[PDB]
């Protein structure tokens, strides 16, 4: 009953340095400060095209036409005006509320909020220390700036507008997304577009049939990326070199990662072998044990006015560690099994489709058909509880709200990929 975004943001609201503030991201020193919005503890929204996270993607110039793949979309003018940034911000917050309004989404977002990147940044083993790429600098009305930890940033997409993805800064010796530590996750995403798909499985899994009659609910797309962030914040992402070739054409050499198959769920996720599944859980059970060991041996903390015991307790809250009467942390195998199974098998695109009761591709091995412009911010177009399929209208049945022919006022096709 409390909203996830407890405040009404307008893009032009003046900064306060707490939940509206110009910010700089780490090691992007030459970037201009960008206006950002802390929509929930540990979660910031930056309504800007992402020219910052990757220095080799510092502008919105497209590749030469011959080098653009069929499923790509370029418009260097998108998200350049205050009005678009306002609409982007409110679209993102509305999607967060839609997700939070399901028990599945409330759960996922709770995992994300407590999945604080581990304080493993010192060369001294016994010293807890933040890793600076898990922070941003938050500029204050008095001109000072304050370093702030955060788990999640939603940013606008780079030159390819439809390349939605969940990325994070790496570390000299730590693979933070796969050693249990976690790291701050940046999700390139836009609520202003969505993708056409086909209700017929034959057509949806054919690369050239159909033109994308049905529109994906962007809440599912966001939840998809949030599921990656969940894996990565708990440092349990599957290595991206574990992939399987799409054996249906083939000489294209297309591959999908296990991380993607897991994230989608459903029948897809059973292609991962049961022997590998138990092995991954064992590996990460051991990485969680290592973190509890590191915490038990921690003697000091630097770079904060917060106490050492509090910071230790933060990570007891994250990994659900047990504590004995000596204050020592340990991993409870029952809670770890449930935590792990929840992060990997419960939080899936397919399960979000069941909770949202929307129409959706039935497999990750489908083919995009079109991109549409949308506008979910008006309540007459899209709601927290119903998405496009407004229950109080003729769009309530047969997923008529996602039907871009029946609900054609809510979709402008921008490009056919076929």
């Amino acid at each position: 009953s409390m909203p996830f975004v407890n405040k009404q943001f307008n893009y032009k609201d003046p900064v306060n340095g707490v939940d509206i503030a110009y910010i700089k991201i780490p090691n992007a020193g030459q970037m201009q400060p960008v206006k950002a919005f802390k929509i929930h503890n540990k979660i910031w929204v930056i309504p800007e095209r992402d020219t910052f996270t990757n220095p080799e993607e510092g502008d919105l110039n497209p590749p030469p036409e011959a080098k653009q793949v069929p499923v790509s979309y370029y418009d260097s003018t998108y998200l350049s005006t205050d009005n678009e940034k306002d609409n982007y911000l409110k679209g993102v917050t509305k999607l967060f509320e839609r997700i939070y309004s399901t028990d599945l989404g409330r759960m996922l977002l709770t995992s994300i909020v407590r999945g604080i990147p581990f304080w493993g940044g010192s060369t001294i083993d016994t010293e807890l220390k933040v890793i600076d790429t898990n922070c941003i600098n938050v500029i204050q009305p008095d001109g000072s700036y304050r370093s702030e930890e955060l788990n999640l940033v939603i940013i606008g997409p780079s030159a390819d507008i439809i390349q939605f993805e969940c990325k994070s800064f790496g570390h000299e010796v730590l693979n933070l997304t796969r050693n249990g530590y976690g790291s701050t996750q940046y999700i390139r995403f836009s609520p202003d577009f969505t993708f056409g798909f086909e209700e017929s499985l034959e057509v949806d899994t054919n690369p050239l049939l159909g033109a994308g009659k049905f529109a994906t609910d962007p809440a599912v797309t966001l939840a998809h990326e949030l599921i990656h962030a969940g894996h990565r914040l708990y440092g349990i992402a599957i290595n991206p070199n574990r992939v399987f070739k799409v054996n249906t054409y083939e000489m294209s050499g297309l591959e999908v990662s296990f991380e993607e198959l897991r994230t989608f769920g459903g029948h897809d996720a059973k292609f991962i072998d049961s022997l590998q599944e138990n092995e991954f859980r064992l590996y990460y059970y051991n990485k969680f044990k290592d973190i509890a060991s590191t915490l038990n041996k921690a003697k000091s903390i630097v770079g904060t006015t917060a106490s050492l015991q509090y910071m230790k307790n933060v990570f007891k809250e994250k990994y659900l560690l047990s504590e004995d009467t000596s204050g020592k942390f340990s991993v409870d195998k029952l809670k770890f099994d449930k935590l792990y199974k929840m992060l990997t098998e419960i939080y899936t695109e397919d399960n979000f489709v069941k909770f949202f009761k929307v129409l959706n591709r039935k497999t990750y091995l489908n083919f995009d058909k079109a991109v549409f412009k949308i506008n979910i911010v008006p309540k007459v177009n899209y709601t927290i509880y119903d998405g496009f399929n407004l229950r109080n209208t003729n769009l309530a049945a047969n997923f008529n709200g996602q039907n871009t022919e029946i609900n054609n006022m809510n979709f402008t096709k921008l490009k056919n990929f076929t």
């Epitope: 028990d103 599945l104 709770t110 659900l320 929840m342």
Partner: nanobody, 120 residues
């Protein structure tokens, strides 16, 4: 905004000593698998007390008062939790509440409460 999950309790009632009553609760919209489902009871001015709980694998736990007369069950397809009470006694009179208790401590959901009255 309403609660993400709705616990819809039903049943209960008023019987004589030695009588039986059934309590039921439908969990609407929950990832039932990640919750322990339990029944509690409370009388005005007193503490809400555990009567019986059951896990997703159907492992049960009974308070001493419930052993031998109450049986708690759980339907993971319908997302319901039931309490069958037998050999009821005046002392069992109370408002009975169903609890969905998140097995990772994230948060809980509580039903509205259903009256059970035992008297002659």
């Amino acid at each position: 905004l309403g609660s993400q999950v709705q616990l819809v309790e039903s049943g209960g009632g008023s019987v004589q000593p030695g009588g039986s009553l059934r309590l039921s609760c439908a969990a609407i919209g929950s990832v039932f698998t990640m919750y322990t489902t339990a029944w509690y009871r409370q009388t005005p001015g007193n503490l809400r007390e555990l009567v019986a709980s059951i896990t997703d694998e159907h492992r049960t736990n009974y308070a001493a008062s419930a052993e031998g007369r109450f049986t708690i069950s759980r339907d993971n397809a319908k997302h319901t939790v039931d309490l069958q009470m037998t050999n009821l006694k005046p002392e069992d009179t109370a408002v009975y509440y169903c609890k969905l208790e998140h097995d990772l401590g994230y948060y809980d959901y509580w039903g509205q409460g259903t009256q059970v009255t035992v008297s002659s």
